[PDB]
């Protein structure tokens, strides 16, 4: 995938989080990106190895 220039690999899945309007990505304790907001439909997904 390549989401707004951010590249990687994994499995996309529906998510049940509510990003604030000023947020785009979401990290964890390991500091890797776990969720992303689709830049077209504006839905939130979950990235899994």
């Amino acid at each position: 995938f390549n989401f707004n220039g951010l590249t990687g690999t994994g499995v996309l899945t529906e998510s049940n989080k509510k990003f604030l309007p000023f947020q785009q990505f979401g990290r964890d304790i390991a500091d890797t990106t776990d969720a992303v907001r689709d830049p077209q439909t504006l839905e939130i997904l979950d990235i899994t190895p």
């Binding site: 989080k17 990003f19 604030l20 000023f22 947020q23 785009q24 990505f25 979401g26 990290r27 964890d28 304790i29 969720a35």
Partner: peptide, 24 residues
């Protein structure tokens, strides 16, 4: 006059979503 601020004055540092963690 003077007053005491107890724990006021905190804002979001970055624009990244986090949940169920403790950040420094």
């Amino acid at each position: 006059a003077y007053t005491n601020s107890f724990t006021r004055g905190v804002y979001y540092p970055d624009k990244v979503f986090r949940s169920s963690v403790l950040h420094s």
